[PDB]
């Protein structure tokens, strides 16, 4: 099915339209911060916006081979 969980309306109308929130921190569209991963390593997130303040996170590593 769908609509299983529910809770948390929007009574107030703050001025947060171009900001993001993860661990109680205001990030600017494009900015980047550090966080924890599913396993344990650290993950880097980059604020995108596309609305309220969407964002993504990808694992950083030096898995780049050399050419020549």
Curated annotation (Swiss-Prot):
Cite the Fibronectin type-I domain residue spans from the record. Answer: 18-60
Give the UniProt subcellular location, in the record's own words.
Answer: Secreted, Extracellular space, Extracellular matrix; Secreted
Which pairs of positions does the record mark as disulfide bonds?
A: 20-47, 45-57
Briefly state the modifications made to the protein after translation: Sulfated.
Origin, by domain of life?
Eukaryota
Which organs or tissues contain this protein? Expressed in the inner limiting membrane and around blood vessels in the retina (at protein level). Plasma FN (soluble dimeric form) is secreted by hepatocytes. Cellular FN (dimeric or cross-linked multimeric forms), made by fibroblasts, epithelial and other cell types, is deposited as fibrils in the extracellular matrix. Ugl-Y1, Ugl-Y2 and Ugl-Y3 are found in urine.
Assembly and interaction partners: Mostly heterodimers or multimers of alternatively spliced variants, connected by 2 disulfide bonds near the carboxyl ends; to a lesser extent homodimers. Interacts with FBLN1, AMBP, TNR, LGALS3BP and COL13A1. Interacts with FBLN7. Interacts with COMP. Interacts (via type III repeats 9-14) with TNFAIP6 (via CUB domain); this interaction enhances fibronectin fibril assembly. TNFAIP6 may act as a bridging molecule between FN1 and THBS1. Interacts with TNR; the interaction inhibits cell adhesion and neurite outgrowth. Interacts with FST3 and MYOC. Interacts with SVEP1. (Microbial infection) Interacts with S.aureus FnbA.
Q: What does this protein do?
A: Fibronectins bind cell surfaces and various compounds including collagen, fibrin, heparin, DNA, and actin. Fibronectins are involved in cell adhesion, cell motility, opsonization, wound healing, and maintenance of cell shape. Involved in osteoblast compaction through the fibronectin fibrillogenesis cell-mediated matrix assembly process, essential for osteoblast mineralization. Participates in the regulation of type I collagen deposition by osteoblasts. Acts as a ligand for the LILRB4 receptor, inhibiting FCGR1A/CD64-mediated monocyte activation. Secreted by contracting muscle, induces liver autophagy, a degradative pathway for nutrient mobilization and damage removal, and systemic insulin sensitization via hepatic ITGA5:ITGB1 integrin receptor signaling.
What disease is this protein tied to? Glomerulopathy with fibronectin deposits 2: Genetically heterogeneous autosomal dominant disorder characterized clinically by proteinuria, microscopic hematuria, and hypertension that leads to end-stage renal failure in the second to fifth decade of life. Spondylometaphyseal dysplasia, corner fracture type: An autosomal dominant form of spondylometaphyseal dysplasia, a group of short stature disorders distinguished by abnormalities in the vertebrae and the metaphyses of the tubular bones. SMDCF is characterized by flake-like, triangular, or curvilinear ossification centers at the edges of irregular metaphyses that simulate fractures. These corner fractures involve the distal tibia, the ulnar aspect of the distal radius, the proximal humerus, and the proximal femur.
User: What is the protein name for this chain?
Assistant: Fibronectin
Name its species: Homo sapiens (Human)
Q: Which residues of the full protein are shown?
A: 2330 to 2390 of 2477
